[PDB]
Amino acid sequence: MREIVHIQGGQCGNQIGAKFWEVISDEHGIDPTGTYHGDSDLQLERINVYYNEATGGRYVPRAILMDLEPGTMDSVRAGPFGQLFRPDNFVFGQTGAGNNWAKGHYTEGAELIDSVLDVVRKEAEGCDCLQGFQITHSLGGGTGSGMGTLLISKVREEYPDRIMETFSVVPSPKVSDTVVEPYNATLSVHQLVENADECMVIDNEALYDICFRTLKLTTPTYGDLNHLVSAAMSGVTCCLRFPGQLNSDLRKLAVNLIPFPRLHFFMIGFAPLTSRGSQQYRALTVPELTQQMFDAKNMMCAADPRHGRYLTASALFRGRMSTKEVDEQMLNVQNKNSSYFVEWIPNNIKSSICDIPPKGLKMAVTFVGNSTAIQEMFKRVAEQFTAMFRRKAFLHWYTGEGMDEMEFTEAESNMNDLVSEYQQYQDATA
Amino acid sequence: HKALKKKSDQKKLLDEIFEANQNAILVKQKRVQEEKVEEEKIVKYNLEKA
Amino acid sequence: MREVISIHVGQGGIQVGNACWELFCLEHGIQPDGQMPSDAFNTFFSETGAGKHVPRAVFLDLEPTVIDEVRTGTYRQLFHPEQLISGKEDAANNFARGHYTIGKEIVDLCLDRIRKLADNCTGLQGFLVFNSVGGGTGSGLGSLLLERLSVDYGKKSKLGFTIYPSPQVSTAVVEPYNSILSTHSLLEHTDVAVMLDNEAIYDICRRNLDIERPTYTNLNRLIAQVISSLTASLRFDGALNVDITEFQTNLVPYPRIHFMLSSYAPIISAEKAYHEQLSVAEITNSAFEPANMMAKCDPRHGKYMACSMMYRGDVVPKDVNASIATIKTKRTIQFVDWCPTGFKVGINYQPPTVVPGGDLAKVMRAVCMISNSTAIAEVFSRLDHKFDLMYAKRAFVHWYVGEGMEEGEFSEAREDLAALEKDYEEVGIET
Amino acid sequence: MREVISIHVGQGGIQVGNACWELFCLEHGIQPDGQMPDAFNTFFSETGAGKHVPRAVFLDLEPTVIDEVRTGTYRQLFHPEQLISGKEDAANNFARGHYTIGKEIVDLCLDRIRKLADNCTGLQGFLVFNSVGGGTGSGLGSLLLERLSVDYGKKSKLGFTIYPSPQVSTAVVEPYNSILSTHSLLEHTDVAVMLDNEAIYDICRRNLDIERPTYTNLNRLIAQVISSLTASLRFDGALNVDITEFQTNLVPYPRIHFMLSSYAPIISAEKAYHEQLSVAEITNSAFEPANMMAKCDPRHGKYMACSMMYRGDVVPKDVNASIATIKTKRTIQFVDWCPTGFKVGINYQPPTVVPGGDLAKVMRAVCMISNSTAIAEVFSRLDHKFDLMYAKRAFVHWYVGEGMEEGEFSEAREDLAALEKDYEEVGIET
Numbered sequence A: 001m002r003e004i005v006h007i008q009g010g011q012c013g014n015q016i017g018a019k020f021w022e023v024i025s026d027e028h029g030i031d032p033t034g035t036y037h038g039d040s041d042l043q044l045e046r047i048n049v050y051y052n053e054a055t056g057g058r059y060v061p062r063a064i065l066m067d068l069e070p071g072t073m074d075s076v077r078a079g080p081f082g083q084l085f086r087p088d089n090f091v092f093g094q095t096g097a098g099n100n101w102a103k104g105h106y107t108e109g110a111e112l113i114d115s116v117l118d119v120v121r122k123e124a125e126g127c128d129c130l131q132g133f134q135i136t137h138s139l140g141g142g143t144g145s146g147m148g149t150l151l152i153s154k155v156r157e158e159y160p161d162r163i164m165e166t167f168s169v170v171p172s173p174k175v176s177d178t179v180v181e182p183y184n185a186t187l188s189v190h191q192l193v194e195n196a197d198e199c200m201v202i203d204n205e206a207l208y209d210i211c212f213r214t215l216k217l218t219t220p221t222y223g224d225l226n227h228l229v230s231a232a233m234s235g236v237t238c239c240l241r242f243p244g245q246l247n248s249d250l251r252k253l254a255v256n257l258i259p260f261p262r263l264h265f266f267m268i269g270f271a272p273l274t275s276r277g278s279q280q281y282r283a284l285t286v287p288e289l290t291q292q293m294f295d296a297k298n299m300m301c302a303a304d305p306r307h308g309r310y311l312t313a314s315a316l317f318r319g320r321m322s323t324k325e326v327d328e329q330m331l332n333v334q335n336k337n338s339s340y341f342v343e344w345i346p347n348n349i350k351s352s353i354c355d356i357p358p359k360g361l362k363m364a365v366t367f368v369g370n371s372t373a374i375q376e377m378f379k380r381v382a383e384q385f386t387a388m389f390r391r392k393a394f395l396h397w398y399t400g401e402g403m404d405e406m407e408f409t410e411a412e413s414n415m416n417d418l419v420s421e422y423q424q425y426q427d428a429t430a
Numbered sequence B: 001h002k003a004l005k006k007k008s009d010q011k012k013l014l015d016e017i018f019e020a021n022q023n024a025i026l027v028k029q030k031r032v033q034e035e036k037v038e039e040e041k042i043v044k045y046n047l048e049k050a
Numbered sequence C: 001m002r003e004v005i006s007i008h009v010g011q012g013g014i015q016v017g018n019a020c021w022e023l024f025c026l027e028h029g030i031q032p033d034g035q036m037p038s039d040a041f042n043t044f045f046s047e048t049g050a051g052k053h054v055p056r057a058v059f060l061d062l063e064p065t066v067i068d069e070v071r072t073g074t075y076r077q078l079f080h081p082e083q084l085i086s087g088k089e090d091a092a093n094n095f096a097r098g099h100y101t102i103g104k105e106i107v108d109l110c111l112d113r114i115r116k117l118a119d120n121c122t123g124l125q126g127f128l129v130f131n132s133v134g135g136g137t138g139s140g141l142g143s144l145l146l147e148r149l150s151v152d153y154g155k156k157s158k159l160g161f162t163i164y165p166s167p168q169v170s171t172a173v174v175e176p177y178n179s180i181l182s183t184h185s186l187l188e189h190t191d192v193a194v195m196l197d198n199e200a201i202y203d204i205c206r207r208n209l210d211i212e213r214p215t216y217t218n219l220n221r222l223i224a225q226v227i228s229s230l231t232a233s234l235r236f237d238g239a240l241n242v243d244i245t246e247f248q249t250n251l252v253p254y255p256r257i258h259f260m261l262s263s264y265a266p267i268i269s270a271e272k273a274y275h276e277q278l279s280v281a282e283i284t285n286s287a288f289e290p291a292n293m294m295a296k297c298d299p300r301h302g303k304y305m306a307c308s309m310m311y312r313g314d315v316v317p318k319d320v321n322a323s324i325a326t327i328k329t330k331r332t333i334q335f336v337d338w339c340p341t342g343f344k345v346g347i348n349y350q351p352p353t354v355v356p357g358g359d360l361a362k363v364m365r366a367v368c369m370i371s372n373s374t375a376i377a378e379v380f381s382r383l384d385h386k387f388d389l390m391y392a393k394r395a396f397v398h399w400y401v402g403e404g405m406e407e408g409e410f411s412e413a414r415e416d417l418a419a420l421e422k423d424y425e426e427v428g429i430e431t
Numbered sequence D: 001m002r003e004v005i006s007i008h009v010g011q012g013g014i015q016v017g018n019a020c021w022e023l024f025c026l027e028h029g030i031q032p033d034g035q036m037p038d039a040f041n042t043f044f045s046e047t048g049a050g051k052h053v054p055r056a057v058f059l060d061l062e063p064t065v066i067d068e069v070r071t072g073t074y075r076q077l078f079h080p081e082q083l084i085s086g087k088e089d090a091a092n093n094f095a096r097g098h099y100t101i102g103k104e105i106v107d108l109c110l111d112r113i114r115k116l117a118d119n120c121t122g123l124q125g126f127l128v129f130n131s132v133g134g135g136t137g138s139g140l141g142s143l144l145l146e147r148l149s150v151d152y153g154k155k156s157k158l159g160f161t162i163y164p165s166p167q168v169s170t171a172v173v174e175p176y177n178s179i180l181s182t183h184s185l186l187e188h189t190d191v192a193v194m195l196d197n198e199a200i201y202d203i204c205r206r207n208l209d210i211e212r213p214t215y216t217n218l219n220r221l222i223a224q225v226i227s228s229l230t231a232s233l234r235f236d237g238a239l240n241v242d243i244t245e246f247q248t249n250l251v252p253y254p255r256i257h258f259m260l261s262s263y264a265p266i267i268s269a270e271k272a273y274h275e276q277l278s279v280a281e282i283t284n285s286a287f288e289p290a291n292m293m294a295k296c297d298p299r300h301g302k303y304m305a306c307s308m309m310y311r312g313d314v315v316p317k318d319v320n321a322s323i324a325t326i327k328t329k330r331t332i333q334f335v336d337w338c339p340t341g342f343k344v345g346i347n348y349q350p351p352t353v354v355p356g357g358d359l360a361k362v363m364r365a366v367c368m369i370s371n372s373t374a375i376a377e378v379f380s381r382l383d384h385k386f387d388l389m390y391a392k393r394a395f396v397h398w399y400v401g402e403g404m405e406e407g408e409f410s411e412a413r414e415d416l417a418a419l420e421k422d423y424e425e426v427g428i429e430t
């Protein structure tokens, strides 16, 4: 009931899901062979949300893995918990798009996406009660940034009533790994703003900063980044698959977080994250953990939240708690930094509680914040895009595969507009 | 077991196809020798006629 | 319980029958003495009751040198003493001499031997005949034997493996006359006629086998391999068997057009076949390559009518169909309009055998194709031109007039050749 | 299931293909006879048993090198009918090799190429090696490129041309055929890498400490560069790059497709291990103006793009930290319309070392392919040298007598002038 099905495409999305389902399997006590081995009875009563049942008591992932190249999926199948995924859901191409949005969205992806759409519709129809869809993708890769939003569009006209969330990795100017990142980020954002019910921005540079400074570990890795992303993702639905004092689904979050339909790009935070040396130091308490949550330094993004005012905030507390000083601390935080809170929305913080804490931790917080500081990533991406496009640099692939500069101009105008009205309400006064 | 059977059959076929190459390593050496023998016969013909 | 009778007449016919008989004996395991070193042999051999095997072959010649060589060779104890018919005077490349003067006194003994051999068989599939067309005695004796057999037995199938002269390479100077006469004789009397010219095989040996100074033995061995590939289906178990009677059900649309040309694959030196996989696709591409054709003709100059092709080894029917699909997709090969499908396929499990001291090696996959196409009119046209060039001045006509042949015999052969060419032209046009 | 076909034409092309083929065999563990005592599929094909037939073709009209190869220790490795050998050498005449005697060989070459390509199913593209200062090599390479461009069409082709040194030359008529081949390949080659000999001589003298170098050392360095370029297709890495993922990141405009390569580190075993060979110092040595294999000064022009591949146990945060320092450096400046110009690739496999060679092994290596606007100097000096002899129509009769028209040089001169004007127009800021 009210279950959701996983769809991942591209190398980044596949490697995110690889750690996500390892985390969820460890959370539910499922062995890598799909056999339940948990200790608490509750570990199975809503295990159906992310797993389908097969004969023999075995549990199968409801995840569809799709890519234009088979290397990443062939590599992850050999990794831990990789045998869980159904081979039928794996769909791969034989050519590749070469980080080109035009190739990944016009020539190869349109022809290839038929089979993955077939498996998606089959899985969605098989579900008892459809709640929504979740996608994980990176905006720095052209092929992924193409077919991810393409599948978003063609799932959108088909299921207009269901909810959808995307976890988008945008290319930051600090850590750059591809030079055509502005182009494909532009083309991906232009389509994502139109159809994304929810989008959650994630920055690898901010991941690097937090792993450098919070955990104080010498050698960070993509595995640690994936673990953080997976924990954050699971915190979004924690109260959905285990009981809490306040049941608050993704659509609860949608109702309470988005004031106007086009403002659906949010920032994620998780707590606690303590260094091994200071893990035995910290005095795990609700006030300290929530103040650690609202620090600008806990975010996984580059937009300094103290450079703007939060439109709204949402906190998902996880563990066995009571609500009293939770509420009073929410009130204290809203009163103390009232300058950083836009005034025409009184009580602009939602609180929810899930009774079971995370595995390995007695108390945790997942924070989602809609703030007026997010304009910065869009502004820098647009600046790079216009600097690289004013001289028509590397535009020749995009022109040679059926797409023209008029679409680029429309996209640039669209996100310039979007930034305009998204900043507009920051200065609005009652 | 099926993969093992197919791999073993293929591998035996490989050891069998180590073979209409070595044969005319030998045979092509023989053909070059026979062309040289024709040249030697031409030389003998020229010497005897002279 | 199936048998076939082989006829070898002429010097080339005897030299190729000998070559095919070493290969058959080696394949069946029969020692040169005919004994058993230690029941599929029943197709080619017959049991005498205890011990040796008697091949179902007959040899004919009016020149006794080759017969004496065979009777003094290592195979003296194999053949029956009184089935190697040898005359006294050679026809000396004269078709009339062998058709009207001295072949008539020998054809009676030949028919006696043929009926004596046929009385033993109970499931006689048919007759194969080998004869050089560029020789007067061979052509005359073959024509007379076909004439007598067609009335003695009637509907029994006969297949003729004729070795036509090369377009420009020739040994004699009067061979066009007897070639045209024999073709006229056999057109209405041979059910299947395979072209086996020597220049194409020379080029094949030079290119693939890398043989620069060849002899007749290699040519005869290649012909023997082709015959073995054709006849292995009758004596070896296969997933898809084809009989001799199942040939001009599929290869001969009209009774007049019964001349076809053969090819074999992989006809390659034993130097670059281990170092490649010998995939069915590449072997059937090599077989269909125009340069690999065993007859000196260009298939690109005419349409294809039919192709009956046999695989031997561990081939897969799925792979065969996949290769046929690629061949059909290929644009350089086009079939006639009234033939949507023209491929007949046969499958046999027995791999080809290798002769010690030979050129070919042992392989696990082989294919032999027999194609009837409309491009064969070129050899008939050039033979007609060569015949006319000498018939304009009535050159060498007295040598045939003085042997009992009438003057008008050449005119009817010329008219038959013209009618045959017109028939090919009429068949080759689309509807 | 990915394949690439290599073409080697000319004496230098054959001598460098041999060198790259010892290195590939050693890296894949293939014996000189070929017998092994599945990543090889990129460069080799399963010939059934033991050995692996390289996906390479050799062409030459002078049979000495072909006979040497067929009589060397690698006689059993190469197929004989792909080592096409003629009878008469072109004697450094471009017209002889392009109009007179190469036409009877190009048909067999195309037949061999078709036979080799029919086996491949995931053909990535073609690489070609040819000495530009040789008539037969230049003519055959030009003819093969023109034929392949219409035979296959959109298949990628990369040419590793060895341009003559600014002042060091072996022949006296090489500028003519160099300009002719450049004119031919400008509209026919997708990527062209400069590999002049004087820069490699300087590298060997300064770093390898060799006072008497030969062609074998240059060929070994070129082979190492090729292996560094192509290791991504056959070795697992945290960030893979394909052949098709090159001229979205190195070629802004179709006309500008000439670039230069650099490699690091280059040091002998006698003093290699006295220093750590850190990622920062190796990437600084690679960017040093004295460490290119092309004799050009990058300080005389702007940088357009750089795609660099690291092999070893690199850390992406270390890569980003080094790139940040390079960007901070003032002596290296990028063009105005390029905010980010760095592309990074990561591979886990360390470079292999050949016994008896000059280079010592490294657990850390970097190879950069850079396109910059400073390459106009070599074109200008080649144009000046060509004009000096074309003023008096010197050596023109030797080409006129081989079927070549008189006006063929004028259009090549105009194309060179237009290309230089295009570089000048691109190099100015907005």
Ligand SMILES: Nc1nc2c(ncn2[C@@H]2O[C@H](COP(=O)(O)OP(=O)(O)OP(=O)(O)O)[C@@H](O)[C@H]2O)c(=O)[nH]1
Binding pocket: C009, C010, C011, C012, C013, C015, C016, C063, C090, C091, C092, C093, C094, C131, C132, C133, C134, C135, C136, C137, C138, C139, C163, C165, C170, C171, C172, C175, C197, C198, C216, C217, C219, C220
């Ligand atoms: N392929 C092939 N053809 C042969 C061979 N021997 C003879 N021929 C052909 O036969 C023609 C001449 O006839 P021969 O076979 O020599 O002798 P014949 O057929 O008995 O006729 P006569 O010469 O009159 O005795 C030549 O033009 C050859 O083309 C052979 O061993 N192999």
Ligand SMILES: Nc1nc2c(ncn2[C@@H]2O[C@H](COP(=O)(O)OP(=O)(O)OP(=O)(O)O)[C@@H](O)[C@H]2O)c(=O)[nH]1
Binding pocket: D009, D010, D011, D012, D013, D015, D016, D062, D089, D090, D091, D092, D093, D130, D131, D132, D133, D134, D135, D136, D137, D138, D162, D164, D169, D170, D171, D174, D196, D197, D215, D216, D218, D219
């Ligand atoms: N780097 C390098 N360049 C070479 C080598 N061998 C030849 N060259 C270059 O090739 C040019 C001359 O052409 P060659 O390679 O000797 O021979 P070719 O290309 O086949 O042309 P022809 O001389 O007409 O046969 C010289 O100017 C060299 O710059 C080599 O081993 N290494």
Ligand SMILES: Nc1nc2c(ncn2[C@@H]2O[C@H](COP(=O)(O)OP(=O)(O)O)[C@@H](O)[C@H]2O)c(=O)[nH]1
Binding pocket: A009, A010, A011, A012, A015, A099, A138, A140, A141, A142, A143, A144, A145, A171, A176, A177, A178, A204, A222, A223, A225, A226, D238
């Ligand atoms: N956290 C994390 N990020 C990654 C990983 N691999 C790649 N990325 C990011 O993804 C971007 C490149 O994405 P790409 O591989 O081209 O996506 P694709 O084109 O869909 O395959 C880079 O900028 C990286 O920052 C990983 O293992 N972990």
Ligand SMILES: [Mg+2]
Binding pocket: C010, C011, C063, C090, C135
């Ligand atoms: Mg005779």
Ligand SMILES: [Mg+2]
Binding pocket: D010, D011, D062, D089, D134
């Ligand atoms: Mg040379």
